[PDB]
Ligand binder design. Sequence first.
Ligand SMILES: Nc1ncnc2c1ncn2[C@@H]1O[C@H](COP(=O)(O)O)[C@@H](O)[C@H]1O
Ligand SMILES: Nc1ncnc2c1ncn2[C@@H]1O[C@H](COP(=O)(O)O)[C@@H](O)[C@H]1O
Ligand SMILES: Nc1ncnc2c1ncn2[C@@H]1O[C@H](COP(=O)(O)O)[C@@H](O)[C@H]1O
Ligand SMILES: Nc1ncnc2c1ncn2[C@@H]1O[C@H](COP(=O)(O)O)[C@@H](O)[C@H]1O
Ligand SMILES: O=P(O)(O)OC[C@H]1O[C@](O)(COP(=O)(O)O)[C@@H](O)[C@@H]1O
Ligand SMILES: O=P(O)(O)OC[C@H]1O[C@](O)(COP(=O)(O)O)[C@@H](O)[C@@H]1O
Ligand SMILES: O=P(O)(O)OC[C@H]1O[C@](O)(COP(=O)(O)O)[C@@H](O)[C@@H]1O
Ligand SMILES: O=P(O)(O)OC[C@H]1O[C@](O)(COP(=O)(O)O)[C@@H](O)[C@@H]1O
Ligand SMILES: O=P(O)(O)OC[C@H]1O[C@@H](O)[C@H](O)[C@@H](O)[C@@H]1O
Ligand SMILES: O=P(O)(O)OC[C@H]1O[C@@H](O)[C@H](O)[C@@H](O)[C@@H]1O
Ligand SMILES: [Cl-]
Ligand SMILES: [Cl-]
Ligand SMILES: [Cl-]
Ligand SMILES: [Cl-]
Ligand SMILES: [Cl-]
Ligand SMILES: [Cl-]
Ligand SMILES: [Mg+2]
Ligand SMILES: [Mg+2]
Ligand SMILES: [Mg+2]
Ligand SMILES: [Mg+2]
Ligand SMILES: [Mg+2]
Ligand SMILES: [Mg+2]
Ligand SMILES: [Mg+2]
Ligand SMILES: [Mg+2]
Lengths: 310, 310, 310, 310
Amino acid sequence: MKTLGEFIVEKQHEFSHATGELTALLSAIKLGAKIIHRDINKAGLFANEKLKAALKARDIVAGIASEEEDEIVVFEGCEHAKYVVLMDPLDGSSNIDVNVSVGTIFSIYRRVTPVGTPVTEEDFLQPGNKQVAAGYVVYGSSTMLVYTTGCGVHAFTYDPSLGVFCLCQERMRFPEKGKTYSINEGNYIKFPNGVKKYIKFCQEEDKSTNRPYTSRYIGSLVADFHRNLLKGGIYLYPSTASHPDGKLRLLYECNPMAFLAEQAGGKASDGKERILDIIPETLHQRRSFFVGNDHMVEDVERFIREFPDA
Amino acid sequence: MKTLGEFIVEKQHEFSHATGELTALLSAIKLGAKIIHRDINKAGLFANEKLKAALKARDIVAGIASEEEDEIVVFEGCEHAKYVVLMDPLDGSSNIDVNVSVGTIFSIYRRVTPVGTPVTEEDFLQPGNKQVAAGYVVYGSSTMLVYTTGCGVHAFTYDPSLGVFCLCQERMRFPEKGKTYSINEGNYIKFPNGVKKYIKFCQEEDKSTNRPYTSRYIGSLVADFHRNLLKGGIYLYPSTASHPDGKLRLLYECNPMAFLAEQAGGKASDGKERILDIIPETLHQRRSFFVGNDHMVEDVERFIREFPDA
Amino acid sequence: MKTLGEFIVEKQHEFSHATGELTALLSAIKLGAKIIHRDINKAGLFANEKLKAALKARDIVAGIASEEEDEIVVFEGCEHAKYVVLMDPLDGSSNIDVNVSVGTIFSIYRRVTPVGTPVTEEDFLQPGNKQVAAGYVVYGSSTMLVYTTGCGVHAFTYDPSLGVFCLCQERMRFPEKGKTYSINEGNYIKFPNGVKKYIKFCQEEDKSTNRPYTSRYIGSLVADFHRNLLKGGIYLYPSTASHPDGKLRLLYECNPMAFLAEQAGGKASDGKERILDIIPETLHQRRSFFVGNDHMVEDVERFIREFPDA
Amino acid sequence: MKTLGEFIVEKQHEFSHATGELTALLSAIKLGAKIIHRDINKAGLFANEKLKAALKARDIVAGIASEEEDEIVVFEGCEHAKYVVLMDPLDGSSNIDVNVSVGTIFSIYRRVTPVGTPVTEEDFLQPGNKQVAAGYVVYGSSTMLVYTTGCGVHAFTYDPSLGVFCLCQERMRFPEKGKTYSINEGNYIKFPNGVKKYIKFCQEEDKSTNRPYTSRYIGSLVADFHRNLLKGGIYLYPSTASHPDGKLRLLYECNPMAFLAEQAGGKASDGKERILDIIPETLHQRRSFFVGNDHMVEDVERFIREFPDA
Ligand SMILES: Nc1ncnc2c1ncn2[C@@H]1O[C@H](COP(=O)(O)O)[C@@H](O)[C@H]1O
Ligand SMILES: Nc1ncnc2c1ncn2[C@@H]1O[C@H](COP(=O)(O)O)[C@@H](O)[C@H]1O
Ligand SMILES: Nc1ncnc2c1ncn2[C@@H]1O[C@H](COP(=O)(O)O)[C@@H](O)[C@H]1O
Ligand SMILES: Nc1ncnc2c1ncn2[C@@H]1O[C@H](COP(=O)(O)O)[C@@H](O)[C@H]1O
Ligand SMILES: O=P(O)(O)OC[C@H]1O[C@](O)(COP(=O)(O)O)[C@@H](O)[C@@H]1O
Ligand SMILES: O=P(O)(O)OC[C@H]1O[C@](O)(COP(=O)(O)O)[C@@H](O)[C@@H]1O
Ligand SMILES: O=P(O)(O)OC[C@H]1O[C@](O)(COP(=O)(O)O)[C@@H](O)[C@@H]1O
Ligand SMILES: O=P(O)(O)OC[C@H]1O[C@](O)(COP(=O)(O)O)[C@@H](O)[C@@H]1O
Ligand SMILES: O=P(O)(O)OC[C@H]1O[C@@H](O)[C@H](O)[C@@H](O)[C@@H]1O
Ligand SMILES: O=P(O)(O)OC[C@H]1O[C@@H](O)[C@H](O)[C@@H](O)[C@@H]1O
Ligand SMILES: [Cl-]
Ligand SMILES: [Cl-]
Ligand SMILES: [Cl-]
Ligand SMILES: [Cl-]
Ligand SMILES: [Cl-]
Ligand SMILES: [Cl-]
Ligand SMILES: [Mg+2]
Ligand SMILES: [Mg+2]
Ligand SMILES: [Mg+2]
Ligand SMILES: [Mg+2]
Ligand SMILES: [Mg+2]
Ligand SMILES: [Mg+2]
Ligand SMILES: [Mg+2]
Ligand SMILES: [Mg+2]
C-alpha cells in the first residue's frame, strides 16, 4: 500500500535537483482536498478560501487564479515562489445542494515573470501545453484524487479509516474504446450542426461499433470526466445559445482536463484544434470542449468538419 | 435535532393500535442503510445479501422480493409476520465502480394471505396503491434517507460523526415548477413519438416558461429522482429498442417512487395511466415511467396523446 | 450482529404491558453517549448539558440529579414522566486533559412522588436496591456501553464505522477469581487499619492464591471498574484524611456501580454493609466503596472487621 | 494549523546537508501510527507486523530491533540505509483487551557499521546518548504523537476528521513541580529500601510541598509517562521479586523515554546513574527506571543513597 504523500516524494526523488517546492505545493493541495472532503460529507450536519488560505498560509505559491474571482490573487510574502495555480475549488457547485458528485480542479504552471516580484496575468495566460501539473478531486459516493505531471495519470482513493489517499493506479488510461457520451441536450437548439450530427451517430443501431451509445450527464465536469476516464466515453460542451463561445473556462477547466485526458491516452479539442495549444487571450476566456476517448473526439471533429455552421 | 430512530417511534404512537412490528421493520431498513453506506464509502480504499441476511436476522418480515443484478429473488421469512418487502438493494449498481451516486429502494406491503401461513406471490403482486411505506437511500457526496408511510415525504440527512440520520424535512414537496428533464437519449431511435416531441418542447427557447430546460441524467434512478424532488424536474424511461415495455421494474422501482412522488405533490405514470393503480401480473414486470413535477408529466402524457405510435 | 437499539426493544417486548417510556429513556441515554464520545475524541481538535439537554429536549424523564450540581433539575413539561435519573456525566474528569480513559455513569429510579407533579429530593434519595437500571459508558482506546435492569450485565462496543453500539456480551460476569487491586495509595496515611492490612495481604508471595496481586489505578472509577469486570479485580476508595467519609458519592457513583457489580456476580460494600441497602440521607452523601470480585471484597471486609480503627 | 507532515519537512530544511532519508523514516513511523490507531479503535466492533511490513515496504531502514510479546525480534532492512530503529510497537498490550490506554515507542540511531554492508548487533547496542530521535504515540480517549530529535519535545494531536496530526506544542516541558507518582505497588515486598522510603515520603502530610502526592498507574509506560509530562509526576519501575534487574527493556523503553524526559527538562535514571549514558551489553537488557520531574527523581536517588540494599 502506497500513500499519495509517499508517492509525491518518490517522484520528486527522480529529480536530483528538485528543491521540494513542487512537492510542498502538491502536498498542500491534497490537504486542501481533505478539508473540502470533510465539509462536503457534512452538509446540513468556503471551499474557495479553504484552498486559498491553506495554500497562502503555507508560503507555497506565487499566486492563484480562482474560477469565480474575476482577478488573480497575489500571495504576499510568496513573491519568491515560482509556481502559480489556477483552480476551480468547487466544480459542479449546483450539485452540492442535491447530494450529487462535485469536484475540485487544479492546474500548475511555472511563472514567466521574475521570481521575487509580484505575479501578473501574464503568468496565468500561458497555453495549456506549459502546465507543470494538473489534477482533480472527485467527491462522490467515495473520494478520489487524480493528477499528472507529464508522466501518466496517477489515481488515488481516499481511505476514511486511515485519513490518507492510497495509490489505486500509477498510470490510469482510457479503455480501448468508449460507448458513453455526456452532454446537456437541453441546449440542443443552437448546437453546432456537427454536434447534432454526432449525437445522431451515437444513437444509430450498430452492434459492431457498440452503438447506440448510452448517455450520462451528472452536471459536474469532474464527475463526468472521471466516469469516462474509468469506463471510456466522451464529454461535450459546445457553443450554445447561452454561451456562443462555449461555457467552460479555457484556463480553469479545459486546460487541466485536457492535460489529464492526453496523459491517459485520450484527446481534448475545441472541435477544430488541440486545447493545449490554444494561446489564451483573457483570464475568463471560454471555449468549446470535447474530451475523452480518442476515437470519439475524432468523430466529433469529423462531423464538425463535414457539417460546418453557417 | 431529531433522529430517525426517534421520529419512527413518535410516528408509531400516533396509532393507538400499533404493536411496533412496522417500527421494527423501518428500523431494520435504516440499519441496513448504514451498513450499505459503510461498504460503499469503502470503494477500494453486497448490499443485497447484507440486507437479506439482516432482515432475516430478526424474523421481521413474512417475505422479501428483490432485484439483484437484473435478477429477481424471493426470500421466505417469518410466517407470523404480516408485512412483506420488495426492494432494490443497489440501484444504479454500475455507478459504484466510478464513485458516482447510487441508491437503495424499498417498498412495504401488508400481506394479503393469512398470518401464520407461508407467503405466496399474491402477497407481492398488489397494486402500488396498497403500499404501507416506500422510500430510498441515496449514497452520494453525502447520504440521505427519504421515505413515506402516507403522511408526507420525510427526508433525513446522515450525520457520520454521530452515526445517526437527522430529520431534515417532515413533508418534502416538489417546488411549484420544474425545469430539468432526465432521460437516456442514447436510446432515442425507438422512443415513442410523444417522448421525442416532448424533448423538442423541452429544448424550445421560451423564457416565460423556463425553457429551454436543463438536462441531467446521473444514471441512478434514486439520484436523479432525489435531485428532481429537491429542485423540481422530471425523470423519464419510456419504451426503447432494448426494452419494448420500459426498463424499470414496476414492483421494485416504479411503485415505490410513484408513492413518494405523489406524496410530494408530484405525478407518476407509464405515459397513459397512474402507476400506483396498475394491477401487476408478474414479479418481473417492467413499465414505462414518467415521474416528477405534475405539469411536466402532464405534458408528456399530452404529447403522447397528440402523437400516438403505430 | 445485534445493536443496542435492537436489544433495548427486544427486552421491552418481554414486558407486554411496557409503554416504551423506559426504552425511550435508555435510547436517549445512548444518544447522549454518542455525543459525548464525539466531543471527547476531538479534544483540541458541556457533557453535563449535553445529557441534560438531550434528555430534557425529549420529554423523557421527570428530573435529573447531576454529580456536579448541588441540586436536582426538574424538567418542565415532563412532570408526567415516572423516571428520574442520577448521573455522573464525566467520571474521571481530570483524565480528559491527558488523553486518558474517562466515563459516564447513570442510575435510573421510578419516582416515589405522584406522576404529574414536580419531583423532589425524595425521588432521588431512594436506596440503591430500588434502581430500575444503571450503567456506564467508558471512553478509552475504544468505547463501550455497559448496563443492567436487573437481569444481568449487557455489554456493547461502539462501532465507529457504523455509528452504533453492537452487542458484545448479553451477560457479562466477573471471572472466577481476581488478581488486581485498584486504590490511590497516595492517601495511605489515614487509610483504615483493615485496608492497610489488606494491601499487605495483596503484596504477599503466594502462587497458590495468585499473589502478589498487580495494581492498576487509572484515576477513573468507570475505567478501573471496567477493567476489573473484564479481567477480575477490586476497586477501593476508603475513608482518607481528605475524605473521612470516603470520596465517592453514594448516589451518583456507588449505587450504580454496585448494582452492576452484583449483576455481574460480584460484590459492593462500604466495608461493613451492602451498598445497595444503605438508606441515603443527603444528595451528596459520600461513602467508602469496595467493589469487584466477591472473594476480594470479602477479604477487605474481613480485615476491616478483624483490625478495627480506634 | 500545522500538520506533522509539514512540520517534519520544515525541520529537515533547517539542515543544509539533509537528504530526506530521516524525513522518510519519521514519515513512515507517523503512517504506522495511523494504522495502529485504526486497528486499536476497532477493538471488536498486530501493530508489530504492520509496522515491520510497512517499514520494509520502502526499504527505509538498515534494520529494526523490536519487543513483541516479551520477545525481541531483529529484522534486516536495506544495507544502503544509515538509520536503525528500535521499537515497542505495542506498549501495555494487555490494556488493549480492556479498552484502556496503550502506546507505541520508537527510537532511532545512525548506524555505526559502514553503509552498504549488513547491520550488526553493534548498531543496536549504542548508548541512549547517541539517539537521533525518540518518540511515542499514545492511543487513549484520543490520540497524540510526541517525539524529539534533540531540539525539544514536539507534541501533536490526531484529528480523525482529517486524518492528520496537528502541532500542539513545539517544546513540551514538565511543569516546575510534580505531585503524582506512578508505580505498581503490587511488587512492594522486594522493592529496594530507598523506593519504599520514597513512597513513605510521598504519603506524608505536608502542604508546603504538595504532599501527600496523588497516585496513578495506568499500566502503560506511554500513558503514565504522557500524563506525568503534561501534569508533572514521576514513573517508577525498580527491581522487584519477579524482575531483579527491573522489568523495562533498556533499549526499547528506557532510552527513548529518557531522551524525551531530558528534552522536556526532566530526569531519567536507574536509581543511581543516567540512563542515556549506560553502555548496553545485550539486546534484551532490562534496567530499573525512574523518570519524570527532576526534583522527584532526585528524591528517589537520595533515598536510595540514604537507605542502601544489602
Ligand atoms: N513531486 C514531484 N513530482 C513530479 N515532478 C517533480 C516533483 N518535484 C519536482 N519535480 C520536477 O522537478 C522540477 C523542479 O522541482 P522544484 O525544485 O520543487 O520546483 C519540477 O518543476 C518538476 O519538473
Ligand atoms: N413507526 C410507524 N410509522 C408509521 N406508521 C406506523 C408505525 N407503526 C405503526 N404504524 C401504523 O400502524 C399500523 C399497525 O402497526 P403494527 O402493529 O406495527 O403493524 C401500521 O400498518 C401503520 O399503518
Ligand atoms: N427496554 C426495557 N428493558 C428492560 N426492562 C424494560 C424495558 N422497557 C420496559 N421494561 C420493564 O417494564 C417496566 C415498565 O416499562 P415502561 O412502561 O416503559 O415504564 C419497566 O420499569 C421495566 O421494569
Ligand atoms: N526531518 C528532520 N527532522 C529533524 N532532523 C532532521 C530531519 N531531516 C534531517 N535531519 C537532520 O539532518 C541529518 C541528515 O539528514 P538525512 O540526510 O536525511 O540523513 C539527520 O541525521 C538529522 O540530524
Ligand atoms: O448546467 P450546464 O449548462 O449543463 O453546465 C454544467 C457544467 O458547468 C460546470 O458546472 C462548470 O463548473 P462550475 O460548477 O465550477 O461553474 C461543469 O462542472 C459542468 O460540466
Ligand atoms: O443505463 P440506462 O439504460 O440509462 O438505465 C439507467 C436506469 O437503470 C437503473 O439502474 C435500474 O436499476 P438497477 O441499477 O437496480 O438495475 C436505474 O437506477 C437507472 O435510472
Ligand atoms: O484523585 P483520586 O482521589 O484518586 O480520586 C479518583 C476518583 O474520583 C473520581 O474521579 C470521582 O469522579 P469525578 O471524576 O466525576 O469527580 C473517580 O472517577 C475516581 O475513581
Ligand atoms: O504489569 P506491570 O508489572 O505493572 O508492568 C507494566 C509495565 O510493563 C509494560 O507493559 C512493558 O511494556 P510492554 O507492554 O511492551 O511489555 C509497560 O508499558 C508498563 O509500564
Ligand atoms: O432530428 P430532429 O427531428 O430535429 O430531432 C432533434 C433531436 O435529435 C436527437 O438526436 C437528440 O438526442 C434530441 O435531443 C433532439 O431533440
Ligand atoms: O508497613 P509500613 O512500613 O508502614 O509501610 C507502609 C506501606 O505499605 C505498603 O503495603 C503500601 O503499598 C505502601 O503504600 C505503604 O507506604
Ligand atoms: Cl503526508
Ligand atoms: Cl496521503
Ligand atoms: Cl438514526
Ligand atoms: Cl436506534
Ligand atoms: Cl445502537
Ligand atoms: Cl499528519
Ligand atoms: Mg466552480
Ligand atoms: Mg467548473
Ligand atoms: Mg439494483
Ligand atoms: Mg434499480
Ligand atoms: Mg464527574
Ligand atoms: Mg465520578
Ligand atoms: Mg510491547
Ligand atoms: Mg513496552
